[PDB]
Amino acid sequence: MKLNISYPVNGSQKTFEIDDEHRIRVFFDKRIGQEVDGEAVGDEFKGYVFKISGGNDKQGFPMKQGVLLPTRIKLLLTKNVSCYRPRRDGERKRKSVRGAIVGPDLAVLALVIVKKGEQELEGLTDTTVPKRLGPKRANNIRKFFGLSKEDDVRDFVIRREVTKGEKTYTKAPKIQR
Amino acid sequence: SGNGAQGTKFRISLGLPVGAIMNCADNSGARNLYIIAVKGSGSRLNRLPAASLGDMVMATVKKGKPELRKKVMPAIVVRQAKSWRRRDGVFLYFEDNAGVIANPKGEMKGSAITGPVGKECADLWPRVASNSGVVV
Amino acid sequence: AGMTTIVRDLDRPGSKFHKREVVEAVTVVDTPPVVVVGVVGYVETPRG
Amino acid sequence: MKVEIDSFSGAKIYPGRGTLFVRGDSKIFRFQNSKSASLFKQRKNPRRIAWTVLFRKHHKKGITEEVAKKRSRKTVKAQRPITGASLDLIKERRSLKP
Amino acid sequence: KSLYTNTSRKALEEVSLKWIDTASKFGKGRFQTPAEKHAFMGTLKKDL
RNA sequence: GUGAACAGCCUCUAGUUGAUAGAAUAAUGUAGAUAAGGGAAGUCGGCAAAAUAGAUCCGUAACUUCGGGAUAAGGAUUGGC
RNA sequence: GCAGUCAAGCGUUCAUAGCGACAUUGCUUUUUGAUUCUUCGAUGUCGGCUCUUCCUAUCAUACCGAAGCAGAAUUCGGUAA
RNA sequence: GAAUGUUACCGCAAUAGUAAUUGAACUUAGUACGAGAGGAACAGUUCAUUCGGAUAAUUGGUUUUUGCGGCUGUCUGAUCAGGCAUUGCCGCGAAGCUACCAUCCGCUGGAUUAUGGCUGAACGCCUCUAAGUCAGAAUCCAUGCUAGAACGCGGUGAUUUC
RNA sequence: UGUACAACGGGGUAUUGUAAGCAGUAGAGUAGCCUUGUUGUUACGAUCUGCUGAGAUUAAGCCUUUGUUGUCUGAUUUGU
Ligand SMILES: [Mg+2]
Ligand SMILES: [Mg+2]
Ligand SMILES: [Mg+2]
Ligand SMILES: [Mg+2]
Ligand SMILES: [Mg+2]
Ligand SMILES: [Mg+2]
Ligand SMILES: [Mg+2]
Ligand SMILES: [Mg+2]
Ligand SMILES: [Mg+2]
Ligand SMILES: [Mg+2]
Ligand SMILES: [Mg+2]
Ligand SMILES: [Mg+2]
Ligand SMILES: [Mg+2]
Ligand SMILES: [Mg+2]
Ligand SMILES: [Mg+2]
Ligand SMILES: [Mg+2]
Ligand SMILES: [Mg+2]
Ligand SMILES: [Mg+2]
Ligand SMILES: [Mg+2]
Ligand SMILES: [Mg+2]
Ligand SMILES: [Mg+2]
Ligand SMILES: [Mg+2]
Ligand SMILES: [Mg+2]
Ligand SMILES: [Mg+2]
Ligand SMILES: [Mg+2]
Ligand SMILES: [Mg+2]
Ligand SMILES: [Mg+2]
Ligand SMILES: [Mg+2]
Ligand SMILES: [Mg+2]
Ligand SMILES: [Mg+2]
Ligand SMILES: [Mg+2]
Ligand SMILES: [Mg+2]
Ligand SMILES: [Mg+2]
Ligand SMILES: [Mg+2]
Ligand SMILES: [Mg+2]
Ligand SMILES: [Mg+2]
Ligand SMILES: [Mg+2]
Ligand SMILES: [Mg+2]
Ligand SMILES: [Mg+2]
Ligand SMILES: [Mg+2]
Ligand SMILES: [Mg+2]
Ligand SMILES: [Mg+2]
Ligand SMILES: [Mg+2]
Ligand SMILES: [Mg+2]
Ligand SMILES: [Mg+2]
Ligand SMILES: [Mg+2]
Ligand SMILES: [Mg+2]
Ligand SMILES: [Mg+2]
Ligand SMILES: [Mg+2]
Ligand SMILES: [Mg+2]
Ligand SMILES: [Mg+2]
Ligand SMILES: [Mg+2]
Ligand SMILES: [Mg+2]
Ligand SMILES: [Mg+2]
Ligand SMILES: [Mg+2]
Ligand SMILES: [Mg+2]
Ligand SMILES: [Mg+2]
Ligand SMILES: [Mg+2]
Ligand SMILES: [Mg+2]
Ligand SMILES: [Mg+2]
Ligand SMILES: [Mg+2]
């Protein structure tokens, strides 16, 4: 099956394809949330700890935290819930869902590095991706720099450069509150 | 089995000897099916011919529309009750016996099938597959 | 000794159970080494 | 190969073993042995039959060290800054004061 | 030893067991090993 | 005592504990039971067997000599405290 | 009841692919008669059930020769129980 | 099961018995043949019928395991624990037995028949036949399988002293 | 007279479905005594819960055993 691994310290991600049911077998009966040591899966992964976060089975149905169960069931889902986006106020839809217990019927696992290992995973530990946006609300700018209500914010707001051919521009947010 | 049965079929415990009445499980107008013969079956002094899942019997409609009563026609068995054992190791049985009336080619008279349907039947009779909801 | 059950994938092209697991009954017969203690030599005759 | 579980009792069902029952609503019930199969057919209720998983889960029998704490947490703390703004002038103006 | 070389395909097939049953045969065996059985039942009134 | 009861089943008083015995538990029997799925296809014929059953309440057709048919049929209920 | 010989005819033409009149030679002993030998100081009917074995005048299955056998289907025949 | 010195072990094999059966689907192939309509077969594959010989891992049936629990009626002052009701009744129930209701297994050489042929005379030609000979069937004989002659047999062990 | 055999006992494996006992602020509730309740008190109450997947049974044709106890020369017959 395919592994979907994220290093959320670097905001990196890359997928790994694991064949050999023996290496795959480590994840079986493990749920979402449960931690999984690494060496079992690959000799690269030695040291690493993985948190199981979700994934998809064949036919593509999502896992859903907390179902328990290692199969599919059909649930009434609501606003504010995994695996459903309501089209309309008060809309609820009965939809199939995959359980949160891993079996060989999954097309992909979703894993979330919690502890780095003895060696560096390629496009994961060695590359790093910057947050898209900066603090927009007044006090959030304060805390992302630790400033007290004395420093005045307008100079700490982030400014993003951008070229207009032979003119580079500078656009900052719009502080609020 | 036989005609329009593309495929072979592994044996399954015979469950419905001649005289058995099974639920009619389609929307043809028929409510039950009375088995009078099992196609493809063989001889033995005193043995009742008996059908199984996926078999084609000859039947009559004991209960149902009168246009369907009083005449013999082909039907396919789709659920059992007599448990039987697949090659994957399992003994399994349905809660009723049931079939769907069909032509010699194996095409279904009706257009839907109410109930689950055994895979071994689905696998054997394409039209039975089309009209199935849950298989096995 | 006795019997027990087995599980194995089937290899049999064209079978509807090609590449599918089957469960099969099996017997087990206890089989410690045998020990050789003699040799007997036979000859052919018109009486066998 | 998949070990299965008993709909009634929640015993593991290793291959070829107990029976499988497909009910009118195409709900599938698996039994490991005719004991569970009978109590089921008898409209008995697993949560009232004292030797079943389901009964035990409900009456909280011997779970003990599952309710015992664990050691699972992280230790991150790392910058990245904001995409488009020069992440080089985001640590020199990140000197704080309180 | 067989009296003929059988060329059956059925004979010839090379099996590879994936699982051998090992639960008790003195009743409805629920467990392969004492370990599995401990894992499932937890601690009993004897034991530790 | 249970219970409608001189029923069946258990008991007090009284009276018996008589019926060749021992050891095994092959076939075939006699007598007593059970069987998945089907359900009279068995048979001259449902022969044998199985199903039903008490009580309280509900609800009961053709037909009739108006008396019946009728426990018609068909349902629900029932312990202990 | 079963099988032949002759070959006038049938078969578009063509006796004999498949058939076959008038005649005529047989075989069989699950038909029915004819007889009256044995049994009337007893050899208990018909059918079915169960079960074995045998015959072949072969319905199917193996291998063949014919055809008015293009193919598919069929018909006739041989070795075959 | 007496007797062929005793007793034991391992074997031979005369004679007798004998067994496997049928169908479909895929593929060949929408091919050969046919104006068309239609429409095969051999090799290969997967299953099935009827039959047979076992076997009980699994599933199911059986229950005096009178094994555990439940229930009525009475009897032992109550309790505990029990007795009786031709096995009181009920649910579960190991073991054993057991079912195309369950699973597994059922061998390959030769010689022939019909028939088609080879060479080839009788009969200068011709002919599968007369001599000689090739190919050949659910047949036959062996292979294999069951018994093992209690008056068929072989190899081998040990063979008693008060 | 020894990796002996047996009877027990132990451990495993099975079957049932939670033993007796004791306790309880569980319980439709009920009695009795007053000091008539700012849980008054003493007991009773089908059933429930805890100790408790407990207790019971488990080779009579299951498996195993470092333990305990015992047993280990009676009879008849056979020769080329
Ligand atoms: Mg604002
Ligand atoms: Mg309907
Ligand atoms: Mg008959
Ligand atoms: Mg009517
Ligand atoms: Mg459709
Ligand atoms: Mg049962
Ligand atoms: Mg059972
Ligand atoms: Mg067993
Ligand atoms: Mg008297
Ligand atoms: Mg007498
Ligand atoms: Mg008597
Ligand atoms: Mg006696
Ligand atoms: Mg029955
Ligand atoms: Mg019925
Ligand atoms: Mg009849
Ligand atoms: Mg009827
Ligand atoms: Mg009849
Ligand atoms: Mg009559
Ligand atoms: Mg009649
Ligand atoms: Mg009667
Ligand atoms: Mg009954
Ligand atoms: Mg009436
Ligand atoms: Mg009440
Ligand atoms: Mg006749
Ligand atoms: Mg003439
Ligand atoms: Mg002609
Ligand atoms: Mg003419
Ligand atoms: Mg006479
Ligand atoms: Mg007479
Ligand atoms: Mg006489
Ligand atoms: Mg007489
Ligand atoms: Mg006589
Ligand atoms: Mg003949
Ligand atoms: Mg011929
Ligand atoms: Mg012509
Ligand atoms: Mg014969
Ligand atoms: Mg003969
Ligand atoms: Mg002797
Ligand atoms: Mg095609
Ligand atoms: Mg033409
Ligand atoms: Mg047969
Ligand atoms: Mg049994
Ligand atoms: Mg009892
Ligand atoms: Mg008490
Ligand atoms: Mg008495
Ligand atoms: Mg009596
Ligand atoms: Mg058989
Ligand atoms: Mg051979
Ligand atoms: Mg020539
Ligand atoms: Mg010749
Ligand atoms: Mg000759
Ligand atoms: Mg000649
Ligand atoms: Mg043969
Ligand atoms: Mg020979
Ligand atoms: Mg053989
Ligand atoms: Mg002898
Ligand atoms: Mg000898
Ligand atoms: Mg002793
Ligand atoms: Mg408990
Ligand atoms: Mg015995
Ligand atoms: Mg001890």
Side-chain angles (χ1 to χ4, degrees), chain A residues 104-152:
Chain A
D105 50 79
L106 297 169
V108 190
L109 254 187
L111 306 191
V112 185
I113 297 176
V114 190
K115 270 78 64 173
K116 177 176 156 183
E118 84 172 42
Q119 187 104 310
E120 247 104 25
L121 295 164
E122 198 57 272
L124 236 56
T125 308
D126 102 311
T127 113
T128 158
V129 356
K131 292 140 162 187
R132 214 86 201 303
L133 276 1
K136 178 185 164 71
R137 217 243 287 289
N139 283 331
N140 283 334
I141 301 148
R142 252 142 213 169
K143 266 60 245 184
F144 190 68
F145 299 112
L147 299 179
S148 71
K149 55 186 193 175
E150 253 63 35
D151 266 326
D152 188 328

Side-chain angles (χ1 to χ4, degrees), chain A residues 27-47:
Chain A
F27 297 106
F28 287 3
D29 285 301
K30 320 306 309 119
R31 301 158 157 78
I32 298 176
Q34 289 206 47
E35 284 180 10
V36 186
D37 288 285
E39 179 155 10
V41 189
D43 284 0
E44 334 85 61
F45 305 115
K46 184 176 188 198

Side-chain angles (χ1 to χ4, degrees), chain D residues 11 13 15-17 19-21 28 30 32 36 38 42-43 46 54 81:
Chain D
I13 293 145
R17 188 55 102 107
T19 74
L20 191 150
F21 162 58
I28 289 179
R30 286 170 209 261
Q32 196 267 346
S36 62
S38 184
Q42 287 188 46
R43 310 272 263 99
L54 221 65

Side-chain angles (χ1 to χ4, degrees), chain D residues 4-64 68 78:
Chain D
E4 222 85 21
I5 100 153
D6 197 292
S7 289
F8 190 84
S9 77
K12 296 182 141 187
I13 293 145
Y14 273 90
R17 188 55 102 107
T19 74
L20 191 150
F21 162 58
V22 164
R23 203 183 51 180
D25 49 13
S26 343
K27 196 166 168 100
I28 289 179
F29 297 87
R30 286 170 209 261
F31 315 97
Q32 196 267 346
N33 61 39
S34 35
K35 192 204 187 170
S36 62
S38 184
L39 276 9
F40 177 83
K41 282 189 241 124
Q42 287 188 46
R43 310 272 263 99
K44 295 287 162 251
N45 166 30
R47 286 150 190 273
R48 296 186 100 201
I49 300 312
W51 58 265
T52 44
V53 159
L54 221 65
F55 164 95
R56 297 190 102 245
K57 206 145 304 175
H58 181 235
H59 286 90
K60 305 220 207 302
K61 299 302 193 164
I63 193 178
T64 22

Side-chain angles (χ1 to χ4, degrees), chain A residues 5-46:
Chain A
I5 320 196
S6 53
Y7 201 24
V9 122
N10 292 334
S12 314
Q13 23 213 326
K14 183 213 218 68
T15 43
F16 296 73
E17 273 135 51
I18 311 304
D19 308 275
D20 291 307
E21 350 212 70
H22 275 324
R23 302 189 202 257
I24 285 191
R25 202 84 133 295
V26 197
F27 297 106
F28 287 3
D29 285 301
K30 320 306 309 119
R31 301 158 157 78
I32 298 176
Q34 289 206 47
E35 284 180 10
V36 186
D37 288 285
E39 179 155 10
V41 189
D43 284 0
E44 334 85 61
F45 305 115
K46 184 176 188 198

